[PDB]
Amino acid sequence: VGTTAVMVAAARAAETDRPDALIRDPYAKLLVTNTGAGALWEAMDAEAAAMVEHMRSYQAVRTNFFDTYFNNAVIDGIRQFVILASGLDSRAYRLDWPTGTTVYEIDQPKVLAYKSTTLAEHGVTPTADRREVPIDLRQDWPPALRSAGFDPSARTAWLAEGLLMYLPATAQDGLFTEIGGLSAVGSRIAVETSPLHGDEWREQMQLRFRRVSDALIYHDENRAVVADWLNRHGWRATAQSAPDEMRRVGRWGDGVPMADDKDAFAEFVTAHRL
């Protein structure tokens, strides 16, 4: 399991531990105890303190947003779900799924094997029909999803959280093209975008975090804007900036360095298949 998957799960666990938790992920602590990279994250000036609080609050707010997305898709009748680069995401276990729901998780084999074995050791199994699809998303992944039982003629709700900024710009286009190819009318997708001007934030966040601890290689100016791309390849797409969403729920901390550039932060794009 990669460092990023652990860090975001540790953030979810930290949120879950608070009385005022925005989201509750009963499985995040379990998943970050059993790697060892989360002991440091478990442990973690004004700007330095604000960055740690931002890490937790950003992850809480992003988690709440994508939870709401899936929950609204269930309400709307959708019964086929796909979590792309699912990492340590426990939504297949912790959200309420109606009978007849299928939830596909796509990630590399070892990531999926870690989550399943780790959960099993704690007596945790899903009640929903959860289906693993072990494959690299830069490779020919549609046949793998299809052989796992996926029905392209059924409405699908797709999720791509914490993924795009870790894929080259050319790979993003290919991913979305394949997704459109597998999506029935009325399908939806929610996506966390790669920040418009945003590899500098990771540096200043690493710097503030390195001081707290001691105490995007694919950034591309040519990357397609996600809402714009979806809106000309068969979707109706809208964007909510992460800062706007954080402010919406009273979780934005303006003490964070780069607070005034909206381009240092992701957007949350939701789209409907035409």
Swiss-Prot record:
The keyword Methyltransferase applies. S-adenosyl-L-methionine binds at D107, D136, L137. InterPro entries: Ppm1/Ppm2/Tcmp (IPR007213), SAM-dependent_MTases_sf (IPR029063), SAM_mthyl_Trfase_ML2640-like (IPR011610). Signal peptide: none annotated. Its EC number is 2.1.1.-. One of its GO terms (biological process) is methylation. GO terms for molecular function: methyltransferase activity. It comes from the Bacteria. It holds the Pfam family LCM. Keywords: Methyltransferase, S-adenosyl-L-methionine, Transferase. The keyword Methyltransferase applies. PANTHER family: S-ADENOSYL-L-METHIONINE-DEPENDENT METHYLTRANSFERASE YKTD-RELATED, S-ADENOSYL-L-METHIONINE-DEPENDENT METHYLTRANSFERASES SUPERFAMILY PROTEIN. Exhibits S-adenosyl-L-methionine-dependent methyltransferase activity. This is Putative S-adenosyl-L-methionine-dependent methyltransferase ML2640.
